[PDB]
Amino acid sequence: PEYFSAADVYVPDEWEVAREKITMSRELGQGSFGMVYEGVAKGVVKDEPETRVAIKTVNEAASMRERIEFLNEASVMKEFNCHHVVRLLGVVSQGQPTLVIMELMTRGDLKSYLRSLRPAMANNPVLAPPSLSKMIQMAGEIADGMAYLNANKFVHRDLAARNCMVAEDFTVKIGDFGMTRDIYETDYYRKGGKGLLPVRWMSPESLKDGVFTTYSDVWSFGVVLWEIATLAEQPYQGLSNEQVLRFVMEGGLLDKPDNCPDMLFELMRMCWQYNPKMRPSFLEIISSIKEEMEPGFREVSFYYSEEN
């Protein structure tokens, strides 16, 4: 809705947390709306006196409209309950700065995580790249979070490794808004001279017609798999953003990464079917690899839940 829309207001509800129950520990990095911190919050998790959390803030210099948009975005997550999607824990809409309390993902974003693995292997011959089993586990976790979102009628539009997060126990989850690292702004292009678009992750139809659907999210998922298999190299390395636009719309595809397991590349190719409807749904993707997932997946996934 644009012509007739919701008002720019935020009504405090059960998600409101008293600032007295929060403490700031240290800075994590600049987010889209403002500095993000790591901290502690009391009474946000059942049977847990205190919880380590991520705290997103809104720059004190932002307009009231921007503070409202911030809260608006957080509110969308109030209805989410998926192990593979970073969880909203609370909101502080009174006083300054405005804050959103989120589940802490101690290992950061997946792109940064993947890139940090290369130098470690280069320094110790004992280490080897992530096994097929580990890559499949990540694939299923990401696919599960996306299947959950799609089931609730939501599309991502910017699915990429930089927007997936890694937990303390290495579980990968779909990240929350305004967390993309500043250094990855280079992953976006002013297509046609308009807004910033993640062209190297976009489907042919998104590039050509400007439409995004669950089908296009699946296309991006394919690119995320490619990122996992390449330890986050830049897709279409030898092409400028403009060249990528043409290459992909004309049916071009990313090359199979070196040493990439056959089954992983085959999944990529299915995610990159030119015709959107020919791509598998996230549920179909999971069904094709569920036998290779960790036993614990059956217990925490949306896939095996009663909601599916």
Q: Is 186 left (phi over 0), alpha (psi -120 to 50) or beta?
A: alpha
Binding residues: 28-36, 56
The rounded distance, in Å, linking the Cα atoms of 248 and 204 is 6
- CA 48 to the chain's CA centroid: 26
The rounded distance, in Å, linking the Cα atoms of 233 and 219 is 17
Work out the burial of residue 59: count CB atoms within 10 Å of its CB; fewer than 13 is exposed, 13-18 middle, 19 or more buried: middle
Give yes or no for a contact between 271 and 279, defined as CB atoms under 8 angstroms apart: yes
Binding residues for ATP: 28-36, 56
The rounded distance, in Å, linking the Cα atoms of 231 and 299 is 29
The rounded distance, in Å, linking the Cα atoms of 308 and 298 is 12
The residue type at 231:
L
Token code pair at residue 234? 């830049």
The residues annotated as belonging to the active site are: 158
Token code pair at residue 122? 């280069």
The rounded distance, in Å, linking the Cα atoms of 221 and 84 is 14
The rounded distance, in Å, linking the Cα atoms of 229 and 260 is 6
Give yes or no for a contact between 155 and 217, defined as CB atoms under 8 angstroms apart: yes
Number of alpha carbons in the 13 Å side-chain half-sphere of residue 142: 27
The rounded distance, in Å, linking the Cα atoms of 101 and 88 is 6
Q: What angle do CA 90, 92, 97 make, to 5 degrees?
A: 135
Q: Is 181 left (phi over 0), alpha (psi -120 to 50) or beta?
A: beta
Structural domains for the chain:
1-103 (3.30.200.20), 104-308 (1.10.510.10)
Q: Is 210 left (phi over 0), alpha (psi -120 to 50) or beta?
A: left
Give yes or no for a contact between 228 and 134, defined as CB atoms under 8 angstroms apart: no
Q: What angle do CA 185, 187, 189 make, to 5 degrees?
A: 90
Helical axes 132-151 vs 262-271, angle rounded to 10°? 20
Cβ neighbours of 144 (radius 10 Å): 31
Cβ neighbours of 37 (radius 10 Å): 20
What torsion do the CA atoms of 163, 164, 166, 172 make, to the nearest 10 degrees? 170
Query: Could you tell me how many residues make up the chain?
Result: 308
Helical axes 282-289 vs 132-151, angle rounded to 10°? 150
Cβ neighbours of 281 (radius 10 Å): 18
Produce one character per residue of 207-217: b if its CB has 16 or more CB atoms within 10 Å, e if not: beeeebbbbbb
Radius of gyration of the chain (CA): 20
DSSP string, the chain: --SS---S-----TTB--GGGEEEEEEEEE-SSSEEEEEEEEEEETTEEEEEEEEEE--TTS-HHHHHHHHHHHHHGGG---TTBPPEEEEE-SSSS-EEEEE--TT-BHHHHHHHHHHHHHH-TT--PPPHHHHHHHHHHHHHHHHHHHHTT---S--SGGGEEE-TT--EEEPPTT---GGGGGG-EEGGGSSEE-GGG--HHHHHH----HHHHHHHHHHHHHHHHHTSPPTTTTS-HHHHHHHHHTT--PPPPTT--HHHHHHHHHHT-SSGGGSPPHHHHHHHHGGGS-TTHHHH-STTSTT-
End-to-end CA distance of the chain: 29
Look at the block and give the residue holding tokens 């946000």: 44
By C-alpha distance, which of 300, 306, 308, 295 is closest to 82?
300
Answer positive or negative: Cα dihedral of 40, 42, 46, 49.
positive
User: Who contacts 167 (Cβ-Cβ below 8 Å, separation ≥6)?
Assistant: 105, 106, 107, 173
